[PDB]
Write an enzyme that holds these catalytic residues in place. Structure first.
Site, short mmCIF file in Angstrom:
data_model
loop_
_atom_site.label_atom_id
_atom_site.label_comp_id
_atom_site.label_asym_id
_atom_site.label_seq_id
_atom_site.Cartn_x
_atom_site.Cartn_y
_atom_site.Cartn_z
N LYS A 180 0.49 -1.26 -0.18
CA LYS A 180 0.25 0.04 -0.16
C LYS A 180 0.73 1.47 -0.24
O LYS A 180 2.63 1.41 -0.02
CB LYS A 180 -1.11 0.04 1.04
CG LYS A 180 -1.88 -1.01 1.10
CD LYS A 180 -2.76 -1.49 0.14
CE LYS A 180 -3.71 -2.08 0.24
NZ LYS A 180 -3.17 -3.92 -0.35
C1 LIG Z 1 -9.92 -3.05 -1.85
C2 LIG Z 1 -9.20 -3.95 -0.70
N1 LIG Z 1 -9.86 -3.43 0.52
C3 LIG Z 1 -9.16 -4.68 1.71
C4 LIG Z 1 -8.53 -5.30 1.36
C5 LIG Z 1 -7.44 -5.79 2.53
O1 LIG Z 1 -6.66 -4.78 3.19
P1 LIG Z 1 -5.89 -6.02 4.32
O2 LIG Z 1 -4.20 -6.49 3.88
O3 LIG Z 1 -5.14 -4.51 4.95
O4 LIG Z 1 -6.83 -6.73 5.50
C6 LIG Z 1 -7.77 -4.33 0.44
C7 LIG Z 1 -5.48 -5.84 0.15
N2 LIG Z 1 -5.57 -5.55 -1.12
C8 LIG Z 1 -8.02 -4.28 -0.35
O5 LIG Z 1 -6.90 -4.42 -2.20
#
Ligand SMILES: Cc1ncc(COP(=O)(O)O)c(CN)c1O
Length: 365
Positions: A180
């Site tokens: 990210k």
């Molecule tokens: C659109 C979206 N929503 C939620 C998430 C979940 O993120 P996390 O890995 O921080 O749990 C992601 C992970 N890339 C994502 O791309």
């Protein structure tokens, strides 16, 4: 020398932040978490922030705090990471998947409105790849029908919509996952304008403990973010503008390079915005490009170049195919079979960049 599609921008600041926490002896949730929450409120313009162990965890506790469960419906795009769909399902609720714009990959107000029923308890738009969804129309829908809007802002740290940061108003969930815009390996944060909701989130991410000396008021989960990780996120957040500027610069070059290539990047939304450029996605239509998406990805890997697939539509994955066999979402599916993410990260060099440009040219013939 393999070139991955993403590399975290870890430097001396990140190591120093960790060292300070290690030396203090207060390594789990504490002052660094409070500082990160205060920082995210300053960044976004919102009033409350709750740091959590991941954006997935944040989505879980946000939906749970709304009291979503058996019988309830939650509107969401299928073109998103599967975590949101899983959280909806695991709470006992019914995910109602709707289509997205064919060129931006973002959920439209029309598609959301068509799916609203009396059982709809939340709407979850996604600010896809760093661009913002049409918040004015979406909040209008939420206000008209009395349905909470929870924004998935995992790709949007640094994104702005019509002059205001994503997360400035309402409720939005950000991610600190390794690929990210800012990272602490795993982590997230829920920003909200509702104090009663924020209090519930803080309790649900730490065993349901609350002051009635804390004790369990209602069972909750363990989703707190260690100060070790929060300090890394704080150091990254301090560099946000420089980091996003490098992403935007590389986006521009890709745009220039795409003019002489058959691959089709995503379209920018028509509304005023600031794009965080989390991903640079291209569509690889076999008929137009002469090569398939999977073939392109494999060809690039042979050349030592990594690519990402964000994302294979949730409704095309095993569990969801079997549960929703009749579900058809044409624009999502068209894109799901053709999208891929090109290398884009703050530390990427032109050696890397034109290594990618010349690999595309080889493949385009
Ligand atoms: C659109 C979206 N929503 C939620 C998430 C979940 O993120 P996390 O890995 O921080 O749990 C992601 C992970 N890339 C994502 O791309």
């Amino acid at each position: 020398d393999f070139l991955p599609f993403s590399r975290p921008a870890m430097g001396a600041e990140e190591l120093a932040a960790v060292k300070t926490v290690l030396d203090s002896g207060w390594i789990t949730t504490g002052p660094k978490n409070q500082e990160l929450e205060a920082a995210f409120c300053r960044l976004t313009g919102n009033q409350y922030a709750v740091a959590v162990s991941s954006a997935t965890a944040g989505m879980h506790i946000a939906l749970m705090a709304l009291g979503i469960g058996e019988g309830d419906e939650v509107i969401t795009p299928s073109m998103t990471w599967v975590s949101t769909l899983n959280m909806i399902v695991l709470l006992g609720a019914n995910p109602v998947m709707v289509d997205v714009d064919r060129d931006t990959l973002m959920v439209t107000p029309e598609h959301i409105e068509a799916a609203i029923t009396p059982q709809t308890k939340a709407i979850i738009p996604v600010h896809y790849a760093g661009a913002p969804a049409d918040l004015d129309a979406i909040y209008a829908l939420g206000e008209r029908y009395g349905i909470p809007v929870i924004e998935d802002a995992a790709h949007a740290t640094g994104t702005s919509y019509k002059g205001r940061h994503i997360g400035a108003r309402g409720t939005a969930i950000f991610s600190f996952h390794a690929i990210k815009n800012i990272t602490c390996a795993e982590g997230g944060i829920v920003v909200t304008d509702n104090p009663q909701f924020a209090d519930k989130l803080r309790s649900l991410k730490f065993h349901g403990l609350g002051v009635d000396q804390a004790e369990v008021l209602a069972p909750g989960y363990k989703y707190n973010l260690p100060d070790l990780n929060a300090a890394i996120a704080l150091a990254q957040l301090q560099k946000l503008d420089a980091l996003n500027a490098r992403r935007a610069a590389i986006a521009a070059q890709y745009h220039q390079a795409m003019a002489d290539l058959p691959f089709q990047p995503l379209s920018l939304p028509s509304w005023e915005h600031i794009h965080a450029w989390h991903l640079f996605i291209i569509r690889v239509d076999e008929a137009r490009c002469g090569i398939t998406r999977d073939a392109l990805m494999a060809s690039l890997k042979t050349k030592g170049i990594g690519t990402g697939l964000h994302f294979r539509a949730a409704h095309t994955q095993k569990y969801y195919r079997e549960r929703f066999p009749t579900l058809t979402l044409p624009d999502t599916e068209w894109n799901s079979e053709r999208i891929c993410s090109l290398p884009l990260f703050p530390d990427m060099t032109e050696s890397d960049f034109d290594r990618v440009i010349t690999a595309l040219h080889q493949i385009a013939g």
